[PDB]
Design a protein around this ligand. Structure first.
Ligand code: UPG
Ligand code: UPG
Ligand code: UPG
Lengths: 1861, 41
């Protein structure tokens, strides 16, 4: 129990506490292991050792070797250890590992924390646990407490010690295994050579490796307990071990330990690593640290949000470190200081506000009262903060000045009187300023710590005295999109449901010159009704959470018509006065209700989506006393506090179906990054002010005062920024607000124009020191002005540059400024390349630099080609903005863009012509820019077009047609296996070859996929509307009339009885999948129920698909009859005419009824013709064509019926659809996952058990499984927190140029089942990983040669009650599971499912599968197997004949999504809860994660063992068993053996080691030469006879070439008949006819072995054999003696083939066969005469013989199939004989024999190599050859026989296999 | 198990080679036997 591990006995519990207490005052002393080492070097050595003996374990254990139980833990759980070796060496730089104090244990400098952690694993069982380690920490802290950070890094050091121990154990077990194998080799070498002198030499050579304990354990056991043993090796080993005081019993007990202890320690290490990984530490740190004990009383620190608590702890640690004072006293002094600052709070009547002195405005006072030394960086930051905005602009101005000086000195050789250079530089250095600002931002991000706010943590929602109104300012000019507006309101409410929050919508309809149109009110009435309906759906506690406000459009001046008082600014102000009470507001009666207090208002926006639990976090930060404005009395500015909050906004990846390349150019950072929390802002980290864009929450009192007291009139869209000038806007940079980005270039131009319009009316607000504005606000307007003026300055500078001189050198000039723009974005990438000054050694983090390089290049190209357009837009915008209020005035084609702009080409041409005239040398540079600029609208239109997305693909029409027809063929399963027999549920399985049976088990996943497949089929236009509703009715009724457990289901269920097959085990994944499918179905039902008018027409495409199916199937008709093919071209002309007619009909857009009636007439005529041609041609394939035509004409009839709806009395239909929608949604939302939540490791339990009410043991911890979909519902329902999603999966593995998501058993369905349901986006990591998975799957298929498609399937292997079984499959590259490359099973449906990303390759793979027999009546089969171990004869692959329901449903869903651009993803997402939970998706692809580390594929597949014997004459004998369950036979390598049937045998055989001449034998005799020999190699064996023997499974082969002739014997056992067969095949080589004769010999003995061997003469006499009419079958059976013997009639037949009809030759008398004085080795039957005189009857020595003379021709082959049969009686032998008397018949039974041998093989856990080993054991167990018996000395004093009866062992007929444990 | 049997078979393997190609030396037929005198039956 020692090894090299770290063991210190076991302290149990309550001893750790006082142990640590003693260690506190008296520690060090000594440790179990421990030595002097360097942490970094030791970690590197540990990692190197793990890689070394992990590669060693990988290269071994697969070639075939024993594996210790401590080894597979390192193999199967290598991902755990390879993640555990991380974190360590990543959380310990050269600074964090030095600042902590050390204890100097044993003389060497040793830090305290890891010294304490050293004994945690040593004094325990090497298993970590929370309670034990907390007890140790408490015991150690009983005297001396720990410090902040010291307590933090306990798990890291624990993991380090654990991996060190693991490395020790791993190297020790590797050494032990190597020593064991070396000892085995040495002892085998010793026993191989019988000499004794060489033994001494070998012993003296290996003496250097005997002192180790793990060398004699196997050695001594092998010597003492073996077969041959020895007497000299033991005489030396025993003496050596007795020397040096070691003996032997100590050695024999040493191996009893150090192995089980190793296994236990390794398992404990694995469990400890898992427990460290999954368990949290924040709650542990709060509950353990003594600092939190002080701060959890008399103050609200216990509820102040986790991030603010971390900031408090960090500040406390920083103060305690630099200032010479302990942390506890620092905290106490801070608490006292906070107490001495007065309560000064309404809600703060109790507790104490502690942040005012830690992070408040009294930090300096505390630091000066405690004696703190500020850091130099802190001094610089404080000084530059005191230097206000001057320090912000100083670096920018300095860099710009350097830029102008450099360019002026470089451009100092130009001529000209130097009157233009200064103005040129002044107007030119705008991009230089932009680059300077970017560099400043990069520097501050790299150095200055980002600023974070402080706030509460409303775990119970928004409390009283805090009410927030979310008001979206828009307009109600929406006839139909008012539904969209209320849906957006519902989504916003669903985002943050908990708390006292209310939602209102404010409107002011369009802009009309008049006052009121006197109609909008009723337009509003519907709205005021619709919202009322929403209230009925949400009215809880008598609280209305939805309100509407409407403005009355008061006239002001002009232009904007009547906007009341002002624009949206005026609307918000009016709302402000209304909220505090204002009866005479400019609003409308009725819709003017306000929910009382509501002191706080959130603005949000229309298209913006609110993140989950976002405003709740904002409410706490706002409500915190530190962040509360105080209202400066002298002026409404608020010196300290925050009245405006603005969270950061990042664009979403795509905008649904609108995703153009323009989106991926002007916005790179798209989505949310969970790793980052705070983004460093220059304006906040240095000045603590932000810019308000109009999306943020704010108060009422201070905001209203500061906004009313300063603004007179003239406010436009820029006023929001002006609001920041009258308050303190703070950028949170912690809460994400996603916002869609417009795709059309025109929309971007309009938005830029609107933004630039408002930025130029603030010039009076800047040039005038009066009014009121922040000092930094003027800088904000200056920055906006320069950012707007950059394009105009660029254009002017460039044109003047090539206008003045531009001789040669100015060319270089046009290269430099274009570089300046390149500076602007690329500097941001500078933050991604610096490894924090190479503090540590990074892992394989990739580069992926080309992606952003190309993105930057594209962005620069777009900017440079739009320079002219942007300059024109800015010029006209500024001209308009000055001409207003400065002079006292106040979709389409390329032609559309041309006419809209009409500016850049003409201006560019004018400038080029004006500049190229002077000098006549400025055109060479001007022409390229001008030609690029005049073409700008072309590239603008090209980039404005939507590109290919995850839904819209360039699939042409032929691919779509093929997919549609494949789907229609596949849907036959649901068409023919859904019946109104109280089932209404598709069976899970359907067999078709092995007497097909319909399965009676159904799962919720099957029900859901069937339901969505029905929806997809109805969308395809395959069935009638009424039929679809009837099927929905049946499915819903069956589901509700079904047993449920708290809403959940018991997974498997019966169909006819609707009961549970086995235990009522609830499946978590299946319930979630069913709920999602039901949600999607209900949403779609609502979608076509809201307007059931246009949905009743039909797609009118399915009939074309089935017509194409008939066209394709017609080509498979073997039309080669006597009457030629008249019906064939009749049918084809009819079908092409029908196709033309339907094409013309669909060309017509009026959909004439007479057209579809004529189509039905044509269809029924075609059906009649098909029936006519079928009843004349009795073929098994024309029935398919006829039924296909019949289904076609039901399809046409259904379309007609859907075309004959009244469209008037539709209210019953509408109410039925509404009721079904409501019931489906209620059933879906009735789910209850809360009880399935394990609040110990988060995640989800695999399932629930109705027995003992217990959960399952395992959990799901991977983001690459279908469980993800369920997780969405788990978040959609709101029963789980958000951290559960982030606390699982998210693993990346390198492959190709990128990284892919790691999946357990990495098939495709893990990556395809989720996206089959909900919608993904191109920019997401999910779509990228799916595309990768597809690419690598195709690559693996190409490498293996076989087409890809490895997925869930049924491997080609049988069992009793044939079901083909079912298991999971994957690829070893992306599976993280050993045992994936040994199967190589291909499932066609995987190709269909993986069609959303590559339709052409999927179709090509499907065609390749179609080239083989992978198609059946019900569409595609289950799968095809290429595994050699499960493939018969010479076939390349075997098609498994199964049909599955969920596979077909997945295929139908995939093809529907591909054809209808992901319609399912849209209808599933058409529920507001789905949009609420969708922001949890979207995310952000990383390209910087710490990626892990990893014709062999062809050889990796399992291969069957082929036991081949070279020469079965001089080598050791080989035997093989064959069984039929009730009939067994023996076949030796020489051709001997016996035949046993149900205990009693048939052919006599005796175990003679020296003779071996018993069994059925085949003899070949030449006629002309007169020579004779045997088919096998034993009795005769003539000269030459190149022979070989193959003992594979089932069949046995004996091949022999004698020169010019080849004879092969195939020995087989029959199926379900109790027979044996021998195929003798003789083939000639030379061109000469030869005569040969065959003879079969076998002695029939129907007895139970012992009876014949006791008194043979009785068995000889009691045999009655005779020959029947048509003589070729000789029968035999014992004569009836008593009334208790079976009789067992046997028979033998020749079954001549490939020959004429000739009489046989038989002889049942062995006396006339042998010769009375000879043996089988030389019989008289092969002499010249006495040729089988055919004597039969009661022969005293009965035998079975059959002779036939066969003339083998020259070149060809002749085969004869001898058969033997045994049956219980005579009345049934006739059917067995006639079954084989039929010609051939060697097949059919052969494949059945192979299948049943596979059944027997798989019924027990036996491998082919195991089978060969078992047969090798049997060869010694049966034959008295004893090469592995006991020792000669051991067997010389035992074996008394009668003594064995004491152990109740018969010892009469028993080989007795011994085994010693 | 399944490894000891394979190891034992290889260690128990490996002069009786020239006796295989000799086949059998046909058979012997004698010219009856001389029926001498001095015999009761
Ligand atoms: O009723 C309106 C709407 C827009 N505009 C002007 O039209 C331009 C486009 O701005 P837009 O985004 O349509 O204005 P809103 O903020 O929606 O009002 C601006 O110059 C607005 O001043 C008006 O004058 N009156
Ligand atoms: O499809 C559109 C959408 C907006 N605009 C804008 O209309 C203005 C061009 O109109 P102009 O020839 O200047 O005449 P007015 O209609 O008097 O100008 C107003 O035109 C819009 C008011 O309806 C607003 O953009 C502004 O208040 C103002 O420019 C420009 O601002 C364009 O951005 C179009 O021309 N076409
Ligand atoms: O085919 C044409 C001709 C003219 N314009 C616009 O009409 C104005 C031309 O009028 P001009 O005599 O050059 O006066 P400006 O100093 O440009 O001021 C204009 O600014 C307003 C905004 O369009 C015009 O409607 C008024 O005629 C005028 O005050 C400019 O805005 C042009 O953009 C067009 O958009 N398309």
């Amino acid at each position: 129990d020692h090894n090299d591990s770290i063991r210190a006995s076991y302290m149990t519990i309550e001893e750790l506490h006082d142990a640590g207490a003693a260690l506190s005052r008296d520690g060090a002393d000594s440790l179990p292991g421990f030595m002097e080492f360097d942490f970094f070097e030791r970690h590197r050595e540990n990692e190197k050792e793990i890689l070394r003996v992990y590669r060693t374990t990988a290269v071994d254990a697969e070639n075939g070797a024993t594996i210790t139980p401590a080894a597979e833990w390192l193999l199967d759980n290598h991902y755990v250890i390879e993640e555990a070796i991380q974190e360590v060496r990543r959380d310990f730089p050269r600074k964090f590992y030095r600042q902590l104090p050390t204890m100097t244990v044993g003389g060497v400098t040793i830090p305290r924390v890891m010294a304490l952690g050293w004994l945690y694993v040593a004094h325990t069982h090497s298993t970590v646990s929370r309670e034990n380690m907390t007890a140790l920490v408490d015991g150690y802290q009983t005297s001396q407490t720990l410090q902040i950070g010291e307590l933090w890094a306990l798990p890291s050091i624990i993991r380090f010690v654990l991996i060190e121990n693991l490395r020790r154990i791993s190297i020790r077990v590797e050494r032990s295994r190597r020593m064991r194998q070396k000892a085995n080799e040495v002892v085998d070498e010793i026993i191989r050579l019988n000499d004794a002198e060489a033994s001494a030499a070998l012993l003296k050579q290996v003496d250097s490796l005997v002192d180790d304990p793990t060398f004699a354990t196997q050695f001594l056991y092998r010597l003492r307990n073996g077969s041959q043993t020895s007497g000299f090796a033991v005489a030396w080993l025993e003496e050596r071990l007795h020397a040096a005081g070691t003996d032997a019993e100590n050695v024999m007990m040493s191996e009893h330990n150090r192995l089980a202890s190793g296994n236990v320690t390794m398992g404990n290490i694995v469990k400890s690593l898992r427990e460290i990984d999954d368990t949290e530490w924040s709650v542990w740190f709060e509950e353990v640290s003594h600092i939190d004990k002080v701060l959890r009383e008399e103050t609200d620190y216990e509820i102040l949000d986790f991030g603010s608590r971390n900031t408090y702890r960090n500040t406390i640690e920083l103060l305690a470190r630099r200032s010479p004072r302990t942390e506890v006293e620092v905290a106490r002094a801070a608490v006292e200081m906070a107490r001495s600052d007065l309560p000064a709070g309404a809600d703060e009547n109790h507790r104490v506000n502690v942040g005012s002195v830690l992070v408040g405005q009294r930090r300096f006072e505390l630091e000066k009262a405690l004696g703190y030394r500020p850091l130099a960086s802190q001094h610089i930051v404080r000084s530059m903060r005191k230097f206000n905005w001057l320090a912000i602009a100083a670096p920018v101005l300095l860099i710009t000045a350097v830029a102008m000086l450099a360019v002026g000195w470089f451009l100092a050789k130009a001529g000209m009187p130097w009157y233009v250079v200064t103005a040129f530089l002044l107007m030119f250095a705008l991009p230089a300023s932009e680059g300077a600002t970017g560099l400043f931002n990069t520097l501050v991000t790299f150095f200055v710590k980002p600023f974070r706010l402080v706030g509460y943590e409303f775990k119970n929602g928004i409390p009283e005295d805090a009410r927030t109104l979310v008001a979206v300012p828009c307009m109600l000019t929406s006839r139909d999109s008012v539904d969209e507006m209320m849906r957006n309101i519902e989504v916003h409410y669903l985002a943050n449901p908990h708390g006292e929050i209310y939602f209102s919508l404010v409107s002011d309809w369009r802009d009309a010159p008049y006052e009121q149109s006197d109609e909008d009110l009723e337009i509003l009435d519907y709205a005021k009704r619709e919202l009322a309906a929403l209230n009925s759906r949400y009215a809880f506690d008598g609280k209305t959470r939805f309100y509407l406000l409407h403005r009355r459009r008061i006239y002001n001046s002009a232009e904007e018509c009547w906007m009341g008082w002002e624009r949206k600014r005026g609307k918000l102000h009016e709302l402000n006065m209304l909220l505090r009470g204002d009866k005479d507001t400019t609003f409308l009666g009725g819709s003017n209700i306000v929910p009382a207090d509501v002191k706080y208002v959130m603005t949000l926006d229309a298209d913006t989506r609110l993140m989950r639990d976002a405003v709740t976090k904002l409410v706490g930060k706002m409500h915190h006393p530190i962040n509360r404005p105080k209202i400066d009395p002298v002026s409404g500015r608020v010196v300290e506090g925050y009245g405006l909050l603005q969270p950061r906004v990042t664009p979403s990846l795509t905008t649904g179906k609108d995703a153009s390349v323009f989106q991926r150019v002007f916005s790179i950072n798209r989505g949310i990054d969970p790793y980052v929390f705070t983004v460093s802002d220059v304006y906040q980290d240095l000045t603590s002010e932000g810019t308000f864009t109009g999306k943020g929450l704010y108060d009422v009192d201070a905001f209203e005062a500061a906004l009313k007291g300063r603004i007179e009139e003239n406010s436009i869209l820029s006023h929001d920024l002006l609001e920041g000038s009258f308050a303190r806007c703070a950028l949170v940079t912690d809460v994400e607000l996603v916002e869609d980005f417009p795709t059309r270039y025109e929309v971007e131009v309009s938005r830029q124009h609107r933004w630039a319009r408002g930025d130029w009316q603030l010039l009076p607000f800047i040039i005038d020191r009066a009014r009121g504005v922040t000092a930094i606000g003027r800088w904000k307007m200056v920055d906006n002005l320069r950012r707007s003026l950059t394009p105009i300055a660029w254009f002017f500078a460039s044109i003047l540059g090539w206008y003045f001189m531009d001789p040669l050198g100015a060319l270089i000039w046009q290269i430099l400024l274009i570089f300046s723009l390149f500076v602007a974005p690329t500097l941001s990438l500078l933050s991604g390349l610096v490894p924090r000054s190479t503090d540590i050694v990074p892992q394989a983090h990739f580069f992926t630099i080309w992606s952003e390089i190309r993105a930057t290049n594209a962005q620069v190209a777009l900017r440079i080609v739009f320079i002219a357009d942007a300059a024109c837009m800015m010029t006209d915008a500024i001209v308009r903005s000055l001409y207003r209020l400065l002079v006292s005035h106040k979709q389409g084609s390329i032609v559309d863009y041309y006419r809209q702009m009409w500016h850049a080409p003409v201006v560019a041409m004018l400038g080029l012509l004006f500049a190229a005239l002077p000098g006549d040398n400025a055109f060479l540079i001007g022409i390229p820019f001008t030609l690029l600029w005049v073409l700008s609208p072309a590239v603008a239109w090209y980039v404005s077009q939507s590109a290919e997305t995850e839904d819209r693909l360039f699939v042409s029409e032929h691919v779509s047609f093929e997919l549609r027809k494949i789907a229609r063929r596949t849907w036959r399963y649901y068409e023919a296996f859904v019946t109104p027999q109280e089932n209404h549920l598709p069976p899970d399985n359907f067999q078709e070859t092995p007497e097909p049976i319909v399965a009676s088990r159904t799962s919720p996943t099957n029900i859901g996929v069937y339901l969505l497949s029905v929806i997809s089929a109805r969308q395809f236009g395959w069935i009638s509307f009424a039929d679809t509703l009837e099927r929905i009715e049946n499915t819903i009724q069956t589901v509700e009339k079904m047993e449920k457990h708290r809403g959940h289901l018991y997974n498997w269920y019966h169909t006819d009885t609707l009961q549970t097959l086995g235990p009522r085990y609830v499946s978590a994944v299946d319930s979630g999948n069913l709920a999602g499918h039901l949600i999607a179905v209900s949403s779609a039902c609502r979608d076509w129920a809201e307007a059931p008018s246009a949905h009743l027409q039909g797609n009118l495409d399915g009939i074309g698909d089935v017509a194409g199916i008939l066209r394709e199937t017609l080509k498979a008709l073997p039309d080669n009859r006597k009457t030629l093919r008249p019906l064939h071209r009749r049918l084809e002309e009819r079908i092409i005419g029908f196709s033309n007619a339907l094409a013309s009909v669909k060309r017509e857009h009026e959909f004439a009824s007479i057209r579809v009636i004529n189509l039905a007439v044509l269809a029924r005529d075609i059906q009649k013709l098909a029936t006519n041609v079928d009843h004349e041609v009795k073929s098994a394939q024309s029935a398919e064509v006829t039924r296909w035509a019949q289904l076609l004409v039901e399809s046409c009839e259904a379309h007609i019926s859907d075309s004959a709806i009244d469209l008037t009395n539709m209210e019953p239909l509408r109410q039925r659809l509404a009721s079904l929608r409501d019931r489906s949604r209620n059933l879906a939302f009735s789910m209850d996952f809360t009880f399935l939540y394990r609040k110990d490791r988060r995640l989800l339990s695999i399932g629930y058990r109705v027995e003992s009410k217990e959960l399952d043991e395992a959990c799901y911890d991977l983001l690459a499984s279908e469980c993800r979909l369920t997780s969405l519902f788990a978040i959609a329902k709101g029963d789980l927190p958000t951290e559960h999603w982030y606390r699982l999966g998210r693993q990346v593995v390198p492959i190709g140029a990128q990284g892919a998501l790691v999946s357990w058993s990495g098939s495709m369905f893990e990556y395809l089942m989720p996206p089959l349901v909900m919608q993904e986006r191109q920019g997401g990591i999910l779509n990228q990983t799916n595309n990768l998975i597809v690419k690598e799957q195709m690559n693996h298929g190409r490498r293996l040669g076989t087409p890809w498609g490895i997925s869930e399937a049924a491997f080609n292997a049988r069992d009793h009650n044939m079901n083909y079984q079912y298991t999971n499959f994957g690829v070893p590259t992306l599976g993280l599971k050993r045992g994936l490359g040994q199967n190589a099973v291909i499932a066609p449906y995987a190709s269909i499912l993986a069609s959303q990303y590559d339709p052409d390759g999927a179709l090509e793979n499907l065609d390749k599968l179609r080239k083989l027999g992978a198609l059946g009546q019900y569409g595609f089969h289950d799968a095809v197997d290429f595994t050699p171990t499960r493939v018969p004869d010479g076939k390349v692959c075997a098609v498994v004949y199964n049909y599955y329901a969920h596979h077909h449903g997945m295929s139908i869903a995939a093809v529907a999504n591909v054809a209808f651009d992901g319609v399912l993803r849209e209808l599933f997402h058409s529920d507001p809860v789905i949009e609420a939970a969708e922001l949890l998706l979207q995310e952000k692809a990383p390209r910087e994660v710490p990626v892990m580390s990893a014709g062999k594929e062809q050889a990796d597949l399992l291969r069957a063992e082929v036991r081949s014997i070279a020469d079965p004459a001089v080598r050791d004998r080989e035997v093989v068993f064959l069984s039929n369950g009730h009939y067994s036979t023996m076949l030796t390598s020489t051709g001997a053996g016996y035949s046993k049937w149900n205990g009693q045998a048939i052919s006599r055989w005796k175990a003679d080691p020296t003779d071996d001449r018993w069994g059925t034998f085949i003899f070949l005799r030449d006629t002309t030469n007169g020579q004779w020999w045997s088919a096998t190699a034993e009795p005769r064996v003539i000269e030459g006879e190149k022979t070989k023997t193959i003992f594979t499974d089932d069949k046995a082969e004996f091949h022999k070439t004698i020169g010019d002739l080849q004879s092969v014997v195939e020995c087989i056992v029959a199926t379900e008949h109790d027979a044996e067969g021998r195929r003798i095949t003789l083939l000639n080589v030379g061109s000469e006819d030869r005569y040969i004769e065959v003879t079969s010999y076998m002695e029939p003995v129907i007895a139970s072995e012992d009876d014949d061997n006791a008194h043979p003469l009785f068995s000889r006499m009691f045999v009655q054999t005779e020959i029947g009419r048509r003589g070729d079958v000789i029968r035999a059976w014992r004569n009836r003696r008593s009334q208790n013997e079976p009789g067992t009639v046997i028979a033998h037949l020749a079954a001549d083939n490939a020959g004429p009809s000739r009489p046989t030759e038989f002889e049942t008398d062995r006396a006339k066969f042998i010769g009375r004085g000879r043996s089988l080795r030389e019989a008289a039957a092969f002499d010249a005469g006495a040729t089988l005189s055919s004597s039969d009857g009661f022969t005293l020595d009965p035998i079975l013989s059959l002779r036939r003379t066969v003339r083998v021709p020259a070149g060809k082959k002749v085969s004869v199939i001898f058969w033997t049969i045994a049956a219980p009686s005579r009345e049934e032998v006739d059917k067995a004989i006639d079954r084989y008397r039929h010609p051939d018949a060697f097949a059919h039974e052969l494949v059945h024999a192979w299948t049943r041998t596979q059944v027997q093989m798989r019924h027990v856990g036996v491998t082919s190599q195991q089978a060969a080993a078992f047969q090798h054991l049997g060869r010694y167990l049966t034959y008295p050859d004893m090469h592995l018996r006991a020792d000669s000395e051991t067997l010389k004093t035992g074996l008394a026989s009668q003594r064995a009866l004491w152990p109740l062992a018969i010892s009469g007929d028993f080989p007795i296999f011994s085994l010693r444990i | 198990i399944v490894d000891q049997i394979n190891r034992a078979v290889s260690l128990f393997a490996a002069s009786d080679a020239a006796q295989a190609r000799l086949p059998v030396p046909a058979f012997p037929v004698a010219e009856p036997v001389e029926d001498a005198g001095d015999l009761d039956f």
